[PDB]
Design a protein around this ligand. Structure first.
Ligand SMILES: *[C@@H]1O[C@H](CO)[C@@H](O[C@@H]2O[C@H](CO)[C@@H](O[C@@H]3O[C@H](CO[C@H]4O[C@H](CO)[C@@H](O)[C@H](O)[C@@H]4O)[C@@H](O)[C@H](O[C@H]4O[C@H](CO)[C@@H](O)[C@H](O)[C@@H]4O)[C@@H]3O)[C@H](O)[C@H]2NC(C)=O)[C@H](O)[C@H]1NC(C)=O
Ligand SMILES: *[C@@H]1O[C@H](CO)[C@@H](O[C@@H]2O[C@H](CO)[C@@H](O[C@@H]3O[C@H](CO[C@H]4O[C@H](CO)[C@@H](O)[C@H](O)[C@@H]4O)[C@@H](O)[C@H](O[C@H]4O[C@H](CO)[C@@H](O)[C@H](O)[C@@H]4O)[C@@H]3O)[C@H](O)[C@H]2NC(C)=O)[C@H](O)[C@H]1NC(C)=O
Ligand SMILES: *[C@@H]1O[C@H](CO)[C@@H](O[C@@H]2O[C@H](CO)[C@@H](O[C@H]3O[C@H](CO)[C@@H](O)[C@H](O)[C@@H]3O)[C@H](O)[C@H]2NC(C)=O)[C@H](O)[C@H]1NC(C)=O
Ligand SMILES: *[C@@H]1O[C@H](CO)[C@@H](O)[C@H](O)[C@H]1NC(C)=O
Ligand SMILES: *[C@@H]1O[C@H](CO)[C@@H](O)[C@H](O)[C@H]1NC(C)=O
Ligand SMILES: *[C@@H]1O[C@H](CO)[C@@H](O)[C@H](O)[C@H]1NC(C)=O
Lengths: 169, 319, 319
């Protein structure tokens, strides 16, 4: 089957941001045309890449793609928020040893200072300016509800929490 | 017709390592003007400082006068980012210029505050209002959306709106909404909602009558004794304590006039060790006032006071 | 004999929002010297600037002369962090002063605070200390270099260096240095200097005694009358006012021994309407205490109090 790829990879964006869903698999059948499925309704896009430009609230929800095969491509989910700080994450479920990037992101490229990440309540790491967390070997204990406190325009903002869980491969 | 004076402020330079000197001099220069009476007042975030802390000098060259005023500040105050204003009064006309600690970059974001009605306004004036004050917005393009609502869905009254540019370069917006007296007393909740296209999300504040228990204030008023020097100043004080909830209005009354609020100072409510809050109020009085009438009444307006939401106590300085 | 002229550099103001103006004026002042030949040259990073870029003028008052020179710089040059030197040549001898773009005390978001001695520690215990606290550092490896110094170069003692990681993922470092009582009272300035490997430059804080006028505190003490239903409790109120500078300690004593600080609530110093500051102190007492001894002493420690920087007033609840 084909799988669904995200550029940028992050399945959690802010309002107004772009994202491009590309989706591909083994070339047993030649690449001719694709079908798209936002929420369940068939979308009017044929091209193999769908350009979701200027996100609205209704742009949330289950996404899916399909080719001329007989079986469909899993339901990637895209949440869209409007807020001050979104703790973005690469993937919501991972298998050990794969890369995991976390990034405490601010509205429209704005720079968040005094950033501290929390994993399950405790202070995982603090840095003066914004940073990635990058763990290449996510342990089974890495599973947690994460969230980040930041400082944008001198004022304090907490991101909505997001629970993530690793599994044994 | 006279030539316009102009005003500019120079300051001490920090040194070759970037370090502040231990004191900072601010020099307000009032260039060539038509000779006349002139006053210079320095303000720190708008409040007048005692004239003893600064000097002033006036020279005349030919037919033109020149004036300079010098203010001395500690390094700590300068580093605390307070704003200083040079206020020039000349022939009944006011000029001004402002300064604060310099900076390479000055980020700021919008913040919002929402008050409750004062007990004085609720129970004496019988015209309660609430105020939503939004400060430190960046003066971008466009008006800032400010909407009032009630949790019950019942209609709101028309509000009034003021927008005022500040010395530090921001734009403070104040919105005042009249509230129903019975509505407020019966526990209605009012919400202020702030929107703007450049904001990430809406800012929301809400206010409602405090749900804590009630307790009436105790009041005690005192006068300080006579001693040398302070012959014509006999500072009075009032202690208001053991009240619940914390919101209280304190005024001073003298000879059937309620004196302006600016005459006296009042501390912020703080918790007593046991049960309730307390405040102190301090009022400096003059010889002519107590010779007019020496009875001074400290009055508290508070939701738990009985029988009419007021409590008052008189003091006489002579006895 | 050699006559040392003094040199000082003043500069233009940025405005009330901290933004730079289109050009920067620097004003080099040579104030109060025996008249003679004088030349003023400006250097930008050690090279002589063109003569037409600055203008000098001279006045005379009595015997003493005064000279000034004004240099105009573009905003860009000021912001490039070049060093500007005012070079005064008087009777063939050279006198210099220098400046460069300042540095705003918060390079990587860290904060540092430096306290003054408490008056109680200084005048009663005669063991004054100062404390330097630096917060919001990263918990990385490599110990912070903390150094103390006096502007005069005289020796300092060892301090209690202590670090601890916080529950919020930050690291705070605190150090307390004992200082000489006389050293402080005669106006020494103490400097706390912190260097971390990740910080781009060293961060410094400085503290020194006040430069304002001196005023001893007035102390007044009152006992509340008995309130119905509270036979076994009373509140004592102490008013401390018209002191300068603002630093003050308040203690309560009973039976010649100082009561714990948790027993009483004291406000922060706030300005009166004229000269000086005031505070109120509040102490609730019990029947067992005043039956043990019904005399309670409100004592203020303040740098302006004579003869031993301490003034007190006793009060009796029964009378
Ligand atoms: C640039 O200049 C402007 C104006 O000079 C500054 O704006 C100030 O902003 C601060 C906060 O950012 C304001 O402080 C707030 O004032 C509110 C107004 O309340 C007044 O009225 C009530 C009665 O309704 C009185 O009881 C009260 O004492 C005031 O007189 C307060 O309600 C706010 O209190 C809130 O914060 C405190 C903590 O500080 C809480 O304990 C409270 O519960 C409450 O949540 C607050 O004090 C200030 O009023 C603004 N100035 C003016 C003139 O309005 C900018 O700050 C300045 N910019 C910079 C960078 O300095
Ligand atoms: C991560 O967590 C740490 C701690 O867990 C936070 O660090 C705190 O930072 C705040 C702000 O920097 C500290 O608050 C400061 O406390 C000082 C204590 O002074 C003592 O002495 C005076 C005089 O005797 C007393 O009045 C006071 O109550 C204390 O007993 C204050 O002096 C500081 O004053 C500063 O703020 C005031 C306004 O409130 C200004 O007027 C002053 O000029 C000065 O700027 C300040 O209030 C706090 O103490 C720190 N915690 C600890 C345990 O020390 C980090 O901030 C946090 N990081 C993030 C990103 O949230
Ligand atoms: C596809 O399914 C999605 C999830 O079932 C659904 O997402 C939801 O969309 C609504 C509005 O489009 C969002 O509501 C937002 O707007 C209201 C009004 O301002 C706010 O009060 C809400 O808090 C929110 O911001 C929902 O939040 C959103 N749900 C999720 C989980 O994101 C899509 O609308 C569906 N799309 C179609 C075309 O059916
Ligand atoms: C979204 O995509 C379009 C098409 O490339 C682009 O022009 C637009 O700028 C994007 N949105 C933003 C906010 O950059
Ligand atoms: C986080 O990583 C992504 C790519 O992995 C990068 O584009 C982004 O800038 C990083 N975040 C920060 C704050 O640098
Ligand atoms: C993620 O973790 C939190 C923390 O216990 C949990 O309450 C939440 O339900 C989890 N999310 C899902 C989808 O199971």
């Amino acid at each position: 089957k084909p799988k669904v790829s995200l550029n940028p990879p992050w399945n959690r964006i802010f309002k107004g941001e772009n994202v491009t869903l590309t989706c591909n698999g083994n070339n047993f059948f030649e690449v001719s045309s694709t079908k798209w499925f936002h929420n369940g309704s068939l979308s009017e896009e044929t091209n193999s890449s769908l350009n979701i430009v200027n996100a609205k609230f209704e742009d949330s929800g289950e996404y899916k793609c399909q080719h001329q095969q007989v079986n469909e491509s899993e339901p990637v989910y895209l949440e869209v928020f409007s807020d001050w700080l979104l703790l973005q994450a690469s993937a919501e479920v991972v298998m050990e040893g794969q890369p995991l990037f976390l990034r405490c992101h601010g509205w429209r490229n704005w720079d968040v200072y005094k950033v501290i990440y929390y994993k399950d309540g405790e202070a995982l790491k603090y840095w003066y300016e914004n940073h990635n967390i990058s763990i290449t070997n996510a342990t089974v204990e890495d599973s947690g509800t994460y969230y980040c406190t930041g400082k944008v325009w001198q004022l304090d903002y907490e991101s909505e929490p997001l629970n993530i869980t690793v599994i044994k491969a | 017709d006279f030539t316009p004076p102009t005003v500019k402020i120079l300051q001490s330079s920090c040194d070759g390592g970037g370090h502040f000197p231990p004191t900072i001099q601010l020099l307000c220069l009032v260039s060539g003007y038509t000779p006349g009476t002139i006053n210079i007042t320095w303000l720190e975030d708008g409040q007048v400082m005692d004239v003893d802390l600064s000097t002033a000098s006036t020279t005349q060259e030919g037919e033109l006068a020149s004036t300079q005023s010098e203010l001395t500040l500690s390094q700590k105050h300068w580093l605390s980012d307070r704003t200083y204003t040079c206020q020039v009064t000349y022939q009944g006309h006011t000029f001004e210029d402002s300064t604060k600690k310099c900076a390479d970059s000055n980020p700021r974001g919008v913040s919002a505050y929402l008050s409750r009605p004062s007990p004085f306004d609720l129970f004496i004036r019988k015209s309660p209002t609430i105020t939503c004050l939004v400060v430190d917005l960046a003066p971008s393009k466009g008006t800032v959306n400010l909407t009032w609502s009630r949790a019950s869905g019942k209609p709101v009254n028309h509000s009034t709106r003021k927008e005022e540019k500040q010395r530090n370069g921001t734009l403070t917006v104040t919105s005042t909404l009249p509230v129903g007296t019975r509505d407020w007393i019966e526990g209605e909740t009012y919400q202020c909602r702030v929107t703007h296209p450049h904001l990430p999300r809406a800012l929301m504040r809400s206010t409602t009558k405090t749900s804590g228990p009630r307790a009436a204030p105790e009041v005690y008023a005192f006068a300080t004794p006579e001693w040398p020097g302070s012959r014509d100043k006999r500072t009075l004080a009032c202690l208001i304590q053991n009240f619940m909830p914390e919101d209280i209005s304190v005024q001073w009354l003298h000879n059937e006039v309620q004196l302006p609020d600016a005459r006296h100072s009042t501390t912020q409510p703080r918790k007593t060790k046991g049960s309730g809050f307390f405040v102190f109020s301090r009022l400096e009085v003059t010889r002519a006032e107590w010779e007019q009438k020496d009875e001074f009444i400290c009055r508290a307006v508070h939701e738990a006071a009985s029988p009419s939401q007021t409590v008052q106590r008189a003091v006489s300085s002579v006895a």
